[PDB]
């Protein structure tokens, strides 16, 4: 699977983990692209399990580093008119959202702590403006909670589950009816769009108890591009990027949707003819991207802490089952 990259990002051990008297049980090796965990736990030390992936981000890794390495070559493809997807997958609290969104002249914000989504909107605007491309950008943001779809961007949207239909004009496509798409007018409008997104998600975790923790959220960008050549020829392209912050790993039943995604990715990597797209909402919505000429990436997040051993081992196993990479001698 040249086209499907699986990478691992170990976040810093944290304060809560110290106070529980946890210790680091995971060793990352960016050069050998390995992650080792002592599976025995504490005094085992005979129990070391090692995994190999496309990339392993050690401690020195910053937000820009994940961006240049995972995202930039995918936006290249998106800008050439392809449809791509990037997943963040892992235990709650391990960095899926920090990676996808991150945190905030830069006066009130920490741009170094910006994640994938705002950096993506920035490059889109910077690259397309520089090369003289006439363009327009729109985004939708939806969440999936217990197999029901909710629009995070509808101002008047109460509650209401959106409805998804097959699209008989495309056998791989899908139509989410009523889905709001904002037009993005500048680099910084993303921040306000993520704000509106969060307010709304917060509401729905009250009147609903759909915790962003237990939900998938799908942030989709569509770019309409027109290039004019030397002679005044017009070249028209439509790119699409899906940035997905998955439901927490920990119970591995949105548990079933995660697993379906796993089989979908494994069938793609292995080229087996049976690809179970229809078995979850997430994979139906995404079949268009995953199934064509494309690039796909999973950022598997983990905590280094001994207290997280089981969920960390499971996340590693999931990512390994996804794209199986033999360990080096």
> Can you give the binding site for Cl ion, defined by CB under 5 A?
10, 27-28, 58-59, 183, 185, 276
Select the binding partner of residue 185 from Ca ion, Cl ion, ligand ADP, none (C-beta < 5 to 8 A, by kind).
Answer: Cl ion
We find the least distance from the C-beta atom of residue 206 to Cl ion, in angstroms, to be 26
* 121: alpha, beta or left? (left if phi > 0; alpha if psi -120 to 50): alpha
Judge whether 239 is annotated as a binding position.
no
Select the binding partner of residue 93 from ligand ADP, Ca ion, Co ion, none (C-beta < 5 to 8 A, by kind).
Answer: ligand ADP
Please give the DSSP secondary-structure letter assigned to residue 83. E
DSSP secondary structure string for all residues of 198-261? HHHHHHHTTTT---TTTSEEEEEEEEEEEEE-TTS-EEEEEEEEEEEEPPP-TT--THHHHHHH
Judge whether 40 is annotated as a binding position.
no
- Taking CB under 5 A as the rule, does residue 130 contact Co ion? yes
Enumerate residues 143-202 that contact Co ion by CB under 5 A.
Answer: 147, 166
Judge whether 200 is annotated as a binding position.
no
Judge whether 91 is annotated as a binding position.
yes
What gap in Å lies between CA 228 and CA 251, rounded to an integer? 52
Select the binding partner of residue 13 from ligand ADP, Ca ion, Cl ion, none (C-beta < 5 to 8 A, by kind).
Answer: Ca ion
Tokens of 32: 């050998």
- Taking CB under 5 A as the rule, does residue 120 contact Co ion? no
Sign of the CA dihedral with 60 first, then 7, 296, and 329 last: positive
Please give the DSSP secondary-structure letter assigned to residue 279. G
Nearest residue (CB) to Co ion, 85 versus 303: 85
Nearest residue (CB) to Co ion, 49 versus 127: 127
Nearest residue (CB) to Co ion, 171 versus 328: 171
What gap in Å lies between CA 48 and CA 14, rounded to an integer? 23
CB atoms under 10 Å from CB of 204, counted, come to 20
Q: In what helix (H) or strand (E) does residue 97 lie, and over which residues does it extend?
A: helix 96-100
**Where do we find the tokens 């999973």?**
298
Tokens of 254: 């949105």
Binding site for ligand ADP (CB under 6 A): 11-12, 90, 92-98, 103, 301
Judge whether 102 is annotated as a binding position.
no
We find the least distance from the C-beta atom of residue 79 to Co ion, in angstroms, to be 9
We find the least distance from the C-beta atom of residue 140 to ligand ADP, in angstroms, to be 20
We find the least distance from the C-beta atom of residue 185 to ligand ADP, in angstroms, to be 28
Gyration radius (Cα) of the chain, Å = 20
Select the binding partner of residue 281 from Ca ion, Cl ion, Co ion, none (C-beta < 5 to 8 A, by kind).
Answer: Co ion
Judge whether 92 is annotated as a binding position.
yes
What gap in Å lies between CA 95 and CA 67, rounded to an integer? 14
What gap in Å lies between CA 96 and CA 326, rounded to an integer? 26
Enumerate residues 9-48 that contact Co ion by CB under 5 A.
Answer: none
Q: Tell me how many residues contact Ca ion (CB under 5 A).
A: 3
Q: What does the angle CA 140 – CA 143 – CA 149 come to, to the nearest 5 degrees? A: 100
We find the least distance from the C-beta atom of residue 73 to Co ion, in angstroms, to be 8
- Taking CB under 5 A as the rule, does residue 281 contact Co ion? yes
Nearest residue (CB) to ligand ADP, 249 versus 260: 249
Tokens of 225: 């591009």
Q: Which of 9, 13, 204, 217 binds Ca ion (CB under 5 A)?
A: 13
**Where do we find the tokens 């129990």?**
47
What residues line the site for Ca ion (CB under 5 A)? Answer: 12-13, 304
The annotated binding site for ATP is made up of: 90-97
Site residues, Co ion (CB under 5 A): 130, 147, 166, 257, 280-281
Which residues contribute to the annotated binding site?
Answer: 90-97
């Amino acid at each position: 699977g040249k086209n499907i990259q699986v990478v691992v990002r170990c976040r810093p051990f944290n304060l809560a983990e110290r106070k529980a008297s946890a210790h680091s049980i995971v060793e990352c090796d960016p050069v050998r692209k390995e992650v080792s965990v002592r599976t025995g736990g504490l005094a085992d030390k005979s129990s070391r399990k090692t995994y190999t992936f496309d990339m392993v981000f050690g401690a020195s890794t910053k937000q820009i580093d994940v961006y240049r390495s995972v995202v930039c070559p995918i936006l290249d493809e998106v800008i050439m008119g392809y449809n791509c997807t990037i997943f963040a997958y892992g235990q709650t609290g391990t960095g899926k959202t920090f990676t996808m969104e991150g945190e905030r002249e830069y006066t009130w914000e920490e741009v170094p702590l910006d994640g994938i989504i705002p950096r993506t909107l920035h490059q889109i605007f910077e690259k397309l403006t520089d090369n003289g491309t006439e363009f327009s950008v729109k985004v939708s943001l939806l969440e999936i909670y217990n197999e029901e779809l909710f629009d995070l961007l509808n101002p008047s949207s109460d509650s209401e589950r959106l409805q998804m239909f097959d699209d008989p004009r495309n056998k791989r496509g899908v139509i989410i009816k009523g889905l709001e798409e904002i037009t993005v007018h500048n680099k910084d409008e993303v921040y306000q769009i993520l704000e509106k997104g969060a307010a709304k998600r917060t509401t729905a975790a009250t009147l609903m108890n759909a915790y962003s923790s237990r939900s998938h959220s799908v942030f989709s960008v569509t770019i309409h591009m027109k290039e004019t050549t030397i002679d005044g020829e017009e070249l028209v392209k439509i790119g699409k990027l899906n940035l997905v912050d998955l439901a927490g790993s920990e119970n591995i039943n949105i548990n079933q949707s995660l697993l379906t995604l796993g089989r979908v990715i494994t069938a793609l990597v292995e080229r087996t003819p049976h690809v179970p797209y229809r078995e979850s909402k997430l994979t139906r919505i995404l079949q268009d991207s995953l199934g064509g000429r494309t690039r796909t990436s999973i950022i598997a997040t983990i905590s280094p802490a001994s207290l997280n051993l089981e969920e960390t081992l499971s996340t590693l196993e999931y990512a390994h089952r996804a794209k199986n990479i033999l360990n080096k001698p």
